[PDB]
């Protein structure tokens, strides 16, 4: 996260760290959506152009974390993966269209002060909140700058951007399964996700029921926090039928 701030304790209790076993390193963020299921970006697990193809045994999921590098004894929980499910129409060839995957945990994780699931939006939530200017929140342990690494989870609040402005900012083809967020040059304020943040949540707090909903997944971007560029996010609601299908079946 570039130009964000340190999270408060328990500020993002759905935050999950995707952790590579060997070598030991941060792969991506992710989010807890029940005691058994974790949501992340497909590209965190599968990206053939760069020979990325992680299997269940390659990684661990770390939940309840605040510190990036510490083993947070008596606080974080480490879970193994039973199965990965990548969207069958995930487009890694071109533009990361449908950049979404689910991970089933081998065992249910116990909820605590530091571990608690986020809500997924329904149609009405999404219609009400997914509006240009409306702000959401992005969290992660990724790079502090495009060109280093945080001590603790970082947080930034960013406004959703009008679709034509998103389109006009890039040569990449933008689909309905994506939205973009970030401040405009004329807006003065800064902030963005960066390397290491992909797969993490873009959340909004409903003013109707005071619940946090995950509207996006950190997906892609060109550099980090550049003027006239915006972060791109997987549109969770648009892909929710897939999410439901997978959990209902497996």
């Amino acid at each position: 996260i570039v130009e964000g701030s340190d999270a408060e304790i328990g500020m993002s209790p759905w935050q999950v760290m995707l952790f590579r076993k060997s070598p030991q390193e941060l792969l991506c963020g992710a989010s807890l959506i029940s005691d058994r299921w974790v949501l992340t970006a497909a590209h965190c697990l599968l990206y053939p152009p760069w020979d990325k193809n992680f299997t269940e045994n390659d990684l661990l999921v770390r939940i309840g974390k605040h510190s990036r590098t510490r083993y947070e004894r008596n606080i974080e929980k480490i879970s193994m993966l039973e199965k990965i499910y990548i969207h069958p129409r995930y487009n890694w060839r071109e533009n990361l269209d449908r950049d979404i995957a689910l991970m089933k945990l081998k065992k249910p994780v116990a909820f605590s002060d530091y571990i608690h699931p986020v809500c997924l939006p329904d149609r009405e939530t999404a219609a009400s909140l997914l509006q240009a200017g409306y702000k959401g929140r992005v969290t992660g342990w990724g790079n502090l700058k495009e060109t280093g690494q945080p001590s603790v989870l970082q947080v930034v609040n960013l406004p959703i951007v009008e679709r034509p402005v998103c389109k006009d900012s890039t040569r990449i083809r933008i689909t309905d399964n994506m939205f973009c967020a970030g401040y405009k040059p004329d807006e003065g304020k800064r902030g963005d996700a960066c390397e290491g943040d992909s797969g993490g949540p873009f959340v909004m707090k409903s003013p109707f029921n005071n619940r946090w909903y995950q509207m996006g997944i950190v997906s892609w971007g060109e550099g980090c926090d550049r003027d006239g560029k915006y972060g791109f996010y997987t549109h969770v609601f648009r892909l929710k039928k897939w999410i439901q299908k997978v959990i209902d079946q497996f």
């Binding site: 328990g10 997924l120 929140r137 609040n157 619940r211």
Partner: peptide, 28 residues
């Protein structure tokens, strides 16, 4: 049933330092 209600915030009626920024942006 309890999704998106944080033990250390919503559940005990405490607000985090910047959530009000989000509320102020939800204008419509």
């Amino acid at each position: 049933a309890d999704c998106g209600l944080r033990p250390l915030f919503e559940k005990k009626s405490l607000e985090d330092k910047t959530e009000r920024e989000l509320l102020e942006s939800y204008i419509d």
